[PDB]
Amino acid sequence: ADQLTEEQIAEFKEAFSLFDKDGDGTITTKELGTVMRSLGQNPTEAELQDMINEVDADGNGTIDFPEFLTMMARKMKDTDSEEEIREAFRVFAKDGNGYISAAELRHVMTNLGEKLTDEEVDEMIREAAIDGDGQVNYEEFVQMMTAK
């Protein structure tokens, strides 16, 4: 009802606090704009009040948890899942290439400027330890998206 299986809720849960500064249990525009900007879009002031307008949950410039994703959930309905995953990589990959690093986890959140500790990431870093090196390119980055 509120919390599902770890990886099932893993995205919208964590992406629940992404926007929610106030968190009346909804998502506001001032948040949705602070979000988008980190993906490489035109930083507009109305973009957030506009983005919640068409995907209006409450229409007071607030979007709920089942609506914000309705577009990625749409990619679940539509078979456009093949051409998006490579551009969805570009989201973080501003280098147009992408290299193997488990440290990437810390660059995505700091791309927004999130604050984490050395031990927080020592676990989030070890939560991705591969072969014994600890780096991960587009292989695990896309698989992160392709896997449910």
Binding site: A10, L39, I85, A88, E104, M109, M144
Partner: peptide, 29 residues
Amino acid sequence: AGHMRPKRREIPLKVLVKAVLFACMLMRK
């Protein structure tokens, strides 16, 4: 052919990027 069999000990992230592959659909041109 070659078996490896993965093991489960720690939980995955699937958000610190998924919450970025999710918003990459709002205005994908």
